[PDB]
Design a protein around this nucleic acid. Structure first.
Ligand SMILES: [Mg+2]
Ligand SMILES: [Mg+2]
Ligand SMILES: [Mg+2]
Ligand SMILES: [Mg+2]
Ligand SMILES: [Mg+2]
Ligand SMILES: [Mg+2]
Ligand SMILES: [Mg+2]
Ligand SMILES: [Mg+2]
Ligand SMILES: [Mg+2]
Ligand SMILES: [Mg+2]
Ligand SMILES: [Mg+2]
Ligand SMILES: [Mg+2]
Ligand SMILES: [Mg+2]
Ligand SMILES: [Mg+2]
Ligand SMILES: [Mg+2]
Lengths: 111, 205, 129, 150, 82, 80, 123
RNA sequence: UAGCUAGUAGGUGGGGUAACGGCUCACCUAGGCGACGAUCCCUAGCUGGUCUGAGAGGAUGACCAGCCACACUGGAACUGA
RNA sequence: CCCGCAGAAGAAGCACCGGCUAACUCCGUGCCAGCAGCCGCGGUAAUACGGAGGGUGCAAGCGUUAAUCGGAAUUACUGGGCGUAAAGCGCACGCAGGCGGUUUGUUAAGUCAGAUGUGAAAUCCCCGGGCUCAACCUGGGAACUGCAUCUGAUACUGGCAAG
């Protein structure tokens, strides 16, 4: 964490690529979150930078919806269902809940 | 539940002999009493009015080797008893088992008295007692068991035990290697240099 | 005003003792006389007296031993605005027993010491130091 | 039998035409062990000069205080300036438990038992004299036999 | 149904039963009418340990109380005069 | 006779019914001041008896309405 | 003063509001800590101090001082916030816990290991 | 939050409950509660006690134990002491 | 739980040291980096920061934070004020409410005495007993300051009567 931040050796980016998109991901299976993220970092480009925040072990939760509340992001899951306490937060504030059966339909839309 | 560090550093800090250096030879000679308690202990002995109350608390505790939580229970027990609270404080400390082992002269030092009691060598009224904090009452006989009897550790203590004060409140015996606690010690028989009015004040606030 | 005439007497004492006046006059009553009798019983005041017929007038002769006053202090304990009643051992002793209080019991007006021996208490009036 | 000590030392500024000069004011209380309580304040430009003048004034103006054995004879109240002082006898029990400024005057007097608890102003200069006025107005059960008894 | 029965208020690995008159529908340590005695099944060979007042229980037996297997044993252990 | 309090009539006609406001003296737990407490209680009665400007004796009974668990026995004097 | 007045209106007591608006009977909390600024101190002192705006789990936006020399704290990775008030920046009622959850401890520190979450070095 | 209450307050008669009762009906009367805080709003199980305190008080209702209420939400009755 | 075997072997950390508050120097840094519960420390001699040495407190705990009370007589019944520091309505007449001169009789509400019933047990407290001691457990007593009824006392207050 310290290296990546200090690596730039400057207080900001040298050019205008500073604009980025944030995503929030929780997949039911542990095998996917590490595997597909690597493929999710392949679609990354210099112009627009995408990064994963708070990869989950499964489902959805209060602190996860809160995580997407602070910074604007899409909340996606390989396979997930909404909790009773989860629906209340998502329905109240403006957010987006989208679950995808396959990784291909996901890799296309993030792009 | 014990100090384990240097015993003479506790004696040097207070500026009075706590009788942890009793052993074989006694009355110091080699001392450096006060003068350098630490590195900068040669600094002037002027000390606060609050600190001298805390200093006397340590003076009493470091002799018998009692911790503040264990000592708070004896102060709490001394308060609920009748008469003077200060006199009953030292009486309950003097009622400890390891202290009675030190007075009769089985252990050479007070730390060695707890050391010997810990190994279950001491028996009271027939029955064995591990715990050094065991409360000794009047008409309670105490003696060393058949195992570990007449050893060079206990034998050397009983020889030099005659050279000290020899307390009136208990019988020394040392012939058959036993002892008897007759009655509770008087105010004149203990204390003198250590004060009861100083130590008690600190727990009021 | 004249609502509490017993507390007036307790004011007349300390004004008399401070000013060094011997004789102090005031209007008398039933309870007014009985409290003054308790002061002489223990021996704070010198002697009490009354003179009149249609208008009774209590005359209290104040005692002086040294330049300092005999009675140290006196305060209105049970007042019309707030009354104080004590059972038997709840009666408060004044200055570790030294001196006496004034207490009105069913049999009569007695001291704090004497009321304990009787086995019954009542309305405490004032603490005579 | 002298039994002398100091409570606290305080620095005080004058601030003359030239500049600020700092004096030192001590407070001491003395007693013989049974009654005879006395105190002295004073001032001086140095610390050891101030305490010497305090003990010099502490000898004179010494007055008898009535004690039964080693305690007060009753619970007594006293007031001085803005310091209101209550106290309890508590006969031969635990004893001499109190905070600094008022600790000195009680212990040197001879009492080993009475409870302090100083209300109102807790100033070291005014907490002393509140005590001695409280001790002076107190009277002995033996010598009140003029008013007591007959 | 009022019942004379032993409730355990003592300690872990060191039982101390309290014989007491209580309704069967209430709990062991719960509600009761009033205490009668005590029974320690640890104790030692000494003057005290087992105590039970026969004047108290024999009243409740007349009023229609039942006796448990323990209380039946403890009455016939201590007996009456013995 | 069963225990009785010294309350007064206060209200006149409730159509074969009567209330009793009961004055007492009670010590206040904290301060120790005496305040007069007024305990109004409904009471059952027969044959439209005398009303306000009276002090009435009272005793406990079974409730013949909602609340109203008391009954009267004797009344002192006539006029207020 | 008069006791008859006190019977009508008894003696009032102040609510005594706490110095930790989070409340919930909680000794510690956690929060998102979105942005970490460097604000100057009050009048008497002069420095550059590390401070973070912590969005708590209950849903209150608050600010908190970062103790210790240097940090990795920024953006994401939720951290522990113990609280307590020390006065330097204008309006800072809390403190962050170093060496807890995802918050790094102070590097190369030897004294005061209890504070700042520094582990004992093997010797 | 200063006015709040139509079964609301009381009586008579009938029905009803294991049992007294506007418990529930018909009829009659116009009362009832309230500045000693009614009603309304906010908050909360209560007590033996625990914690603090010299005491008076303050705060608190974990475990232990009594009583009441609740048994996914709302409502109702049966069986049965 | 008792006995035997081996061998000091397997077992001490934590805060703090400017004053308050028990316990001090050097070095590094130089209003930088940081400490802080409060007043405050650091801009080249820092016992206040960081490290080291030394020391103090406490101990299988230690410290920080959070919560309650005490300290706080700073809601003050016990137990505080209101000229100038926060605080006497601008002033007056007045209902409810609070309080009431003095003499006698009566009532016994308040108050006070005695007795009965009740105030569960546990807990707290006191003297004992049992787990190797203590915590813990437990016998008995005291206490639970309260409330009600009955039988008495009549000083004071209240009701009532005559003054
Ligand atoms: Mg321990
Ligand atoms: Mg009917
Ligand atoms: Mg609730
Ligand atoms: Mg207090
Ligand atoms: Mg249901
Ligand atoms: Mg049925
Ligand atoms: Mg110091
Ligand atoms: Mg530090
Ligand atoms: Mg330097
Ligand atoms: Mg207070
Ligand atoms: Mg004030
Ligand atoms: Mg003014
Ligand atoms: Mg009980
Ligand atoms: Mg024992
Ligand atoms: Mg009268």
């Amino acid at each position: 964490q310290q290296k990546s931040k200090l690596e730039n050796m400057f207080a900001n980016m040298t050019e205008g690529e500073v604009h980025e998109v944030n995503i929030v991901l929780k997949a039911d299976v542990q095998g996917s979150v590490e595997a597909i993220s690597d493929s999710l970092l392949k679609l990354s480009t210099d112009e627009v930078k995408v990064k994963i925040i708070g990869s989950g072990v499964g489902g959805i939760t209060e602190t996860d919806a809160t995580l997407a509340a602070a910074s604007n992001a899409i909340l996606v899951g390989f396979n997930v269902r909404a909790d009773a306490s989860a629906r209340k937060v998502i329905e109240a504030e403006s957010l987006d809940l989208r679950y995808y059966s396959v990784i291909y339909n996901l890799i296309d839309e993030v792009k | 539940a014990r100090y384990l560090g240097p015993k003479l550093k506790l004696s040097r800090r207070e500026g009075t002999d706590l009788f942890l250096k009793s052993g074989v030879r006694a009355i110091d000679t080699k001392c450096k009493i006060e003068q350098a308690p630490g590195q900068h202990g040669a600094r002037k002995p002027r000390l606060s009015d609050y600190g001298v109350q805390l200093r006397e608390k340590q003076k009493v505790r470091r002799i018998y080797g009692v911790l503040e939580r264990q000592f708070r229970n004896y102060y709490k027990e001394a308060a609920r008893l009748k008469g003077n609270t200060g006199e009953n404080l030292l009486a309950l400390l003097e009622g400890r088992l390891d202290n009675v082992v030190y007075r009769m002269g089985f252990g050479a030092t007070r730390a060695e008295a707890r050391q010997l009691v810990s190994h279950k060598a001491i028996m009271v009224n027939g029955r064995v007692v591990n715990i050094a904090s065991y409360q000794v009452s009047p008409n309670d006989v105490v003696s060393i068991r058949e195992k570990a009897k007449k050893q060079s550790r206990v034998k050397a203590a009983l020889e030099l035990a005659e050279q000290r004060e020899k307390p009136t409140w208990l019988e020394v015996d040392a012939g058959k290697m036993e002892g008897t606690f007759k009655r509770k010690p008087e105010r004149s028989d203990l204390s003198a240099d250590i004060n009861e009015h100083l130590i008690v004040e600190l727990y009021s606030k | 005003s004249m609502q509490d005439p017993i507390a007036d007497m307790l004011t007349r004492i300390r004004n008399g003792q401070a000013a060094n006046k011997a004789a102090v006059t005031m209007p008398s009553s039933k309870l007014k006389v009985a409290i003054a009798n308790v002061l002489k019983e223990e021996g704070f005041i010198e002697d009490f007296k009354v003179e009149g017929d249609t208008k009774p007038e209590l005359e209290l002769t104040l005692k002086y031993f040294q330049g300092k006053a005999v009675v140290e202090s006196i305060q209105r304990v049970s007042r019309p605005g707030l009354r104080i009643y004590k059972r038997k051992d709840e009666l408060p002793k004044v200055m570790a027993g030294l001196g006496i209080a004034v207490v009105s019991t069913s049999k009569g007006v007695m001291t704090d010491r004497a009321a304990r021996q009787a086995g019954l208490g009542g309305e405490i009036i004032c603490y005579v130091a | 039998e002298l039994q002398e000590k100091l409570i606290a030392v305080n620095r005080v500024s004058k601030t003359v035409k030239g500049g600020r000069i700092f004096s030192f004011t001590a407070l001491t209380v003395v007693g013989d062990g049974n009654g005879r309580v006395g105190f002295g304040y004073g001032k001086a430009r140095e610390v050891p000069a101030a305490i010497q003048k305090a003990m010099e004034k502490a000898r004179r103006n010494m007055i008898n205080v009535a004690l039964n054995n080693g305690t007060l004879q009753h619970p007594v109240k006293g007031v001085h300036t803005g310091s209101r002082v209550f106290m309890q006898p508590a006969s031969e029990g635990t004893g001499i438990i109190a905070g600094g400024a008022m600790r000195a005057v009680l212990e040197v007097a001879g009492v080993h038992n009475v409870l302090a608890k100083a209300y109102g102003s807790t100033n070291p200069i005014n907490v002393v004299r509140a005590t001695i006025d409280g001790l002076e107005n107190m009277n002995s059960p033996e010598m009140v036999a003029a008013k007591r008894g007959k | 149904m009022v019942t004379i029965r032993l409730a355990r208020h003592g300690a872990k690995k060191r039982p101390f039963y309290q014989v007491v008159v209580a309704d069967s529908r209430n709990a062991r340590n719960g509600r009761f009418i009033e205490r009668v005695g005590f029974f320690n099944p640890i104790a030692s060979e000494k003057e005290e340990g087992t105590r039970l007042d026969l004047d108290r229980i024999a009243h409740w037996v007349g009023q229609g109380a039942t006796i448990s297997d323990r209380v039946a044993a403890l009455i016939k252990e201590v007996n009456k005069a013995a | 006779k069963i225990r009785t309090l010294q309350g007064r009539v206060v209200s006149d006609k409730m159509e074969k019914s009567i209330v009793v406001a009961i004055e007492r003296f009670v010590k206040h737990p904290i301060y120790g001041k005496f305040i007069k407490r007024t305990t109004k209680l409904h009471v059952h009665d027969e044959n439209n008896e005398c009303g306000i400007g009276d002090v009435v004796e009272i005793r406990e009974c079974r409730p013949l309405s909602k609340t109203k668990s008391w009954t009267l026995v004797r009344v002192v004097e006539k006029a207020v | 003063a008069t006791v008859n007045q006190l019977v009508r209106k008894p003696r009032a007591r102040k609510v005594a509001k706490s110095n930790v608006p989070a409340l919930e009977a909680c000794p510690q909390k956690r929060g998102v800590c979105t942005r970490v600024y460097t604000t100057t101190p009050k009048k008497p002192n002069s420095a550059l101090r590390k401070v973070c705006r912590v969005r708590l789990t209950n849903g209150f936006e608050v600010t908190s001082y970062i103790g210790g020399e240097g940090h990795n704290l920024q953006e994401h990775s939720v951290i522990l916030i113990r609280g307590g008030r020390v006065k330097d920046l204008p309006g800072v009622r809390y403190h962050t816990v170093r060496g807890a959850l995802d918050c790094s401890g102070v590097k190369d520190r030897k004294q005061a290991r209890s504070k700042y979450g520094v582990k004992r070095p093997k010797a």
